[PDB]
Design a binder for this molecule. Sequence first.
Ligand code: HEM
Ligand SMILES: *[C@@H]1O[C@H](CO)[C@@H](O)[C@H](O)[C@H]1NC(C)=O
Ligand SMILES: *[C@H]1O[C@H](CO)[C@@H](O)[C@H](O)[C@@H]1O
Ligand SMILES: *[C@H]1O[C@H](CO)[C@@H](O)[C@H](O)[C@@H]1O
Ligand SMILES: *[C@H]1O[C@H](CO)[C@@H](O)[C@H](O)[C@@H]1O
Ligand SMILES: *[C@H]1O[C@H](CO)[C@@H](O)[C@H](O)[C@@H]1O
Ligand SMILES: [Mg+2]
Length: 208
Amino acid sequence: QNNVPNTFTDPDSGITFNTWGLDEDSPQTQGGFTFGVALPSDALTTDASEFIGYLKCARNDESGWCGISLGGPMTNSLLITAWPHEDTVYTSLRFATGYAMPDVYEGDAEITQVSSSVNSTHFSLIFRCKNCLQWSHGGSSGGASTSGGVLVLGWVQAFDDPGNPTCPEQITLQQHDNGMGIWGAQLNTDAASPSYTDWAAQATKTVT
Ligand code: HEM
Ligand SMILES: *[C@@H]1O[C@H](CO)[C@@H](O)[C@H](O)[C@H]1NC(C)=O
Ligand SMILES: *[C@H]1O[C@H](CO)[C@@H](O)[C@H](O)[C@@H]1O
Ligand SMILES: *[C@H]1O[C@H](CO)[C@@H](O)[C@H](O)[C@@H]1O
Ligand SMILES: *[C@H]1O[C@H](CO)[C@@H](O)[C@H](O)[C@@H]1O
Ligand SMILES: *[C@H]1O[C@H](CO)[C@@H](O)[C@H](O)[C@@H]1O
Ligand SMILES: [Mg+2]
């Protein structure tokens, strides 16, 4: 993904994100991928605990899932998994101590949704990730530091639908097979707005 961020304003929410991703012509993944963040107003000076995220992920004959690692590597990092079923986008907060099926994250992080969309080729989500930037699971603790002006992030996409797709806590996954990477997601001032609190208040949907 690009390290230097693009800037994007979602029309309906009015939320402005820094974004990074891969185009549909990228050889690194099929169908493109985009991730973005909006942060608390002082995030570039003081480490935030939360963000509002944007995900745009690909579908392969209307199947597949995508994921972000908030720490970079698959392991020892809070993981966000996302996938569509019918007209709903689900997420699951996950954590892996090794290169195997990630477990449900045991910490207090919580995702709420602002909006989502599903069509035949893509799905997208805008979501608030509360208490997501510092994590603790099974004695492993870590976090990301917005005040450093960069987030080390990982992404994956996959072609198969998760098993039990209507139950985030019980999903099963195959090893992702539609690209992966770790990159430096550089942040600029567009990523932090006085409007953050108003924007976060739009995240009123809890998708169970
Ligand atoms: C049963 C499900 C899963 C299996 C078996 C699995 C397995 C693996 C394996 C073996 C690698 C190393 C590939 C290589 O080095 O070439 C890897 C890389 C990665 N995986 Fe997973 N994975 C699974 C689910 C996830 C989920 C849910 C996420 C995040 C939402 C994730 C994030 C990553 C990332 C970011 C990398 C690249 C960085 C790294 O090597 O640590 N994976 N995966
Ligand atoms: C399909 O939905 C995605 C959601 O992000 C959107 O970006 C894309 O333009 C849509 N395509 C069509 C043909 O409607
Ligand atoms: C962020 O967004 C809020 C709500 O849309 C605006 O009122 C404000 O000017 C800031 O740019
Ligand atoms: C959300 O709430 C904060 C309070 O910290 C305001 O300062 C901001 O303008 C937004 O309305
Ligand atoms: C919280 O807020 C949105 C509108 O901002 C509602 O449409 C949604 O159903 C939830 O109640
Ligand atoms: C949906 O429900 C969760 C708890 O189930 C709340 O924390 C959230 O703010 C939204 O109301
Ligand atoms: Mg920077």
